[PDB]
Amino acid sequence: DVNTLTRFVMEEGRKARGTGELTQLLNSLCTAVKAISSAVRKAGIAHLYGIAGVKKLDVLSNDLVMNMLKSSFATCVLVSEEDKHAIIVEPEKRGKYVVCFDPLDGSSNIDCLVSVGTIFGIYRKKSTDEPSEKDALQPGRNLVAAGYALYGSATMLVLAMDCGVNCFMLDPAIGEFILVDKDVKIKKKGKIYSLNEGYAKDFDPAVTEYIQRKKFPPDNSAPYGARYVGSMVADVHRTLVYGGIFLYPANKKSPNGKLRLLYECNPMAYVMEKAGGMATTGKEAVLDVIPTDIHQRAPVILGSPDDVLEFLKVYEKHS
Amino acid sequence: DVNTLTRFVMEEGRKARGTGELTQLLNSLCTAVKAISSAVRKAGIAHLYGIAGKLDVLSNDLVMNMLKSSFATCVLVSEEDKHAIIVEPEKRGKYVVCFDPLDGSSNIDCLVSVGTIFGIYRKKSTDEPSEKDALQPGRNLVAAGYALYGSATMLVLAMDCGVNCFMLDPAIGEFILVDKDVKIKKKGKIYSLNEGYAKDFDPAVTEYIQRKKFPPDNSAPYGARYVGSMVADVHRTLVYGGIFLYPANKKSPNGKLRLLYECNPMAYVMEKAGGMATTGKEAVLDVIPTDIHQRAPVILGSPDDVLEFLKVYEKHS
Amino acid sequence: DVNTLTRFVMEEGRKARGTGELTQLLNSLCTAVKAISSAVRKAGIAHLYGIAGKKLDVLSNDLVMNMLKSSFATCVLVSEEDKHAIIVEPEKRGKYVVCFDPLDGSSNIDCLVSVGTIFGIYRKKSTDEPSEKDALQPGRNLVAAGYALYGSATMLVLAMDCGVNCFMLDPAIGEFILVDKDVKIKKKGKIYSLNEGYAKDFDPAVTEYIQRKKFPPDNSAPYGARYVGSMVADVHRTLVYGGIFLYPANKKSPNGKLRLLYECNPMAYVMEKAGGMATTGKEAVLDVIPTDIHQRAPVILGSPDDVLEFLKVYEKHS
Amino acid sequence: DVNTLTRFVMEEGRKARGTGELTQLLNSLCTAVKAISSAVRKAGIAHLYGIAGKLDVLSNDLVMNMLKSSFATCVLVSEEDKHAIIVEPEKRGKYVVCFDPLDGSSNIDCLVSVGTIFGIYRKKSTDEPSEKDALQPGRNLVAAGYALYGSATMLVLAMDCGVNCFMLDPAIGEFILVDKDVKIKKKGKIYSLNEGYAKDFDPAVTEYIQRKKFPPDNSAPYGARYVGSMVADVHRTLVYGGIFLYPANKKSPNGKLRLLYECNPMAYVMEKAGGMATTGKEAVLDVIPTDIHQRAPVILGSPDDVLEFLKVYEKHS
Ligand SMILES: O=C(NCCCCCNC(=O)NS(=O)(=O)c1cccc(Cl)c1)NS(=O)(=O)c1cccc(Cl)c1
């Protein structure tokens, strides 16, 4: 049977005999993603260039996600890459869920038409206190659901829950996300490594060693290929589909990495683990870091389990 | 005033007082590109998954059929076809078109940016058309460019008048002129190549890359980007400046990318925008091909960056 | 706050504390209507004319049929396109019965006339093995009904116990946007709608009523006339602007022409939930007890003052 | 071979060996029609209803701006503008365009079919451009037609070569030629007018309509259709044959529809398709206008039906 994201989520909700709140949240999120996708592909750009005689895409995308989530009545605390403090849903619209999201990841270079994406992680509120920013300071282990939308050659929604990872293709002719890849698992070992090698002068020695081994294998195996889009959603999705490893590690100038834990690293780590992959800071699983600031950064190395394990050995070899 | 690709091409054609043949060719290609874009964004994919109870082939078929029916072409060379296609006499025009209909498609399973690359030559002789009519150096190009199917779809068209960039508005199926007479930065800060082949790198490439990470003039090290889809990496080079490299390695001693419908169109776009494109030994556009599918090494982009590579290259003789 | 059909239906279901089965049905139907709309607007027609070198009513039927079966919410399906009721296979059976016209008005789609999808939704009432008889319930038993109009824009009108709500399809995002809430028809309109080409066959009551619209005996202004000849388009105008719509019996159609199960009953339900009326002349459309799934009925529907004025003329002629 | 409106128009222009000015006009109008269709189908309406927290004026702006920026027009007359619009000198071309940007829009609240109607003239004098350049009889038309925004969007284009119908494919923004050199039936079976105004009918209209419903012989009575949107009713008349009437009466001795941008374009399409269009007194196309907004009675459609109406009409004259 054909399956849509709408039908899939609804049926998962009936199996769990839930109240319908999480289904409303996800339906609302899916609608924002379709609207973001439409704007990213530049529908209506003729009007901006005067065909009949405005907001940047990252601002518009943040507005789309914020309003659809607020009006879902399913959320109470919202953290966005775009906002310094967490948004507290007003009382009449409050639900039980906390959502951390990056509304248009990779948009800083969208002038070159690079792939971009939306990343989200969804938690249930743990305290009975009045909702506050503190409710977003949970470890990734507490995620109820996470995933991303990739606006690439086509638009795809990847949704991870306890049931596994499922991939839905947006058919723009009808505005429906079509389930095309069920219960996805990552390869045990890949053949692609992904990081910005231009910063080689600042690499940690374990990172230097690991990359040198990918290019000059000591066991006479074939050297890995290299890919680095520079858009996390695009690089991470390719890692899921083809296997391999993705690194944005800590270094001398950036002991905490550059990517953001709450709405970049935690969702991608959760997608990876539900797909049989791994995601580490070097010191521990990304999902086990207990955050103290909603915008705090984290190092991240993620992907096929054999590859992440090989990186960790090199990291531990350097103490 | 707003400008469309259709209106722009028509008006250029009226300026040259041409017969309208090239305008018809370019119009047909523009239609093919919009149809490819629609398929790449997966419009109608629900029908494939049973709602009512191949992409590189379709892309080739779209370009082939639109160019044939334009009545403007006589010889068509595609990455997909072993031999050149000869247009039947009743639909034969005077132009020769080399194209890559869905460049980067080998990895489209991960939704990487993909694109269509095309180069257009005029056939001058009165001989019966043949594959040999496509064996021209890039210097002979009448027009070239690409369509990038990335976060949005854009057509970049280079001609004698320069380089112009048109954004596809999917709401009305119109390419809107958004960047006129584009020129590349004199010098950039991003280098682009597959460093997985480092063990097989030519000594000049190894040193040049070392200069990007550890600059000799105490400048900041370049960032690295490599999408692995030639159209995406080359378009970023155009917009942000910098350098793109696909040099020879052990698996590809003449490089990997194809001269006729990958390197030459991109070399032409680069040169019309104030950039450079070299094999190391000569300008790509000066290579005289002997095989429609022959490969070439290519280093292209901002002029200061390519000149810096060439200095390193000449240092290794 | 902005509201979508998906969000609207889900919230009604949470208020009713239902199992989610009817929401699954409606979501599936909403998906089919968007696919029908895309095909009706001729997306992809360039491929049919050879750009790379099913009939619309059949495709529309297949879209509705397959989306409803795979919803797991239906057991019996009646369509204008199928001679007999479709019985949903045992593993996919739900509790609802759906009668629908997948592309109403398609006989003149050659001139690009507005066309539409009409549907009526019942709960299966008998405990017998599902059969064509499960669709022979009077319209009074409808749980939900409505239509999609593929006109200048695509609109879905959904009527339920909570009232009538209208959603505009935004094709940029494949989303039905709530634009008119808890809609009510005007008490009295100024437009009458029927095929006057059958004037020679009209019964005396229709002849008099139409004469009153053109030459009003109180010397008020004559009604204007509109007749698209596509029921969804004419009924939708009647809902939005008021007035009256008539397709009475004639010599070629002595039992009327429109179909009771999936044209007259869904439109009667929308009209009554919007404060309007729908009569055969002898009784409310919704009270007719069907005996055959494709049976026809005469229908007079629209603003309550207008239908009541017609019924007075009808009783005057006995 | 597949054919698009863009390719079709270009080829007609190459056969006529023209300067390309009329082709640029038609391309610009086609683009405006795709943008009108997108707004009429309500693309982007979610933003208007607050997803991120007028139509006839927009349609008029779209046509006006695309025609102005074509450099092919000098005088523009629209149903939406009180006076003729004079194109600024630097953008002036040789054509005069009369149009209704969104005919039928007054009832667009009910999602009734709507349309754009246009007629294109060559400027006849060398005088400074003015409203007077639009006061030509329909006989002087170079091109006319309409776009119907119905169940699908179709552009009907009438020229000296005949009437051709192009279906808009929204997936790629291309008008695809689907019905070539179309001719209307000699005689139809449908009559189309607002019978709610029966008490004010001219006696000839009363008798003629009564004959359609109660034929004096053994023929079948005609069916009746009246959408109330001229483009929708005229297009059905073209496809199915029959007759469409908006005739004169004592209270409206000149009819209601407008000669320059409703009656004349539809008359030209009908006559090129082998049909007829009369005021009752003369051919619509032979009326010489004195006012850009003047009205004209119009009876049009299959020639046997129009002649029969004139027989009844002259009996009461
Ligand atoms: O989805 C959840 N539950 C199923 C949704 C049903 C609730 C709403 N009820 C109805 O709609 N009823 S009805 O009969 O159709 C009806 C009644 C009246 C009018 C109408 Cl129109 C329709 N739960 S959950 O927590 O979100 C969840 C849990 C686990 C995983 C996931 Cl992914 C989500």
Ligand SMILES: O=C(NCCCCCNC(=O)NS(=O)(=O)c1cccc(Cl)c1)NS(=O)(=O)c1cccc(Cl)c1
């Ligand atoms: O495009 C070129 N020339 C433009 C001239 C258009 C030819 C078509 N003629 C008309 O359209 N005539 S008309 O009056 O409008 C007319 C008349 C009757 C009916 C109709 Cl419907 C229309 N030349 S070129 O070599 O292709 C070229 C050269 C350089 C760069 C480029 Cl990019 C292309």
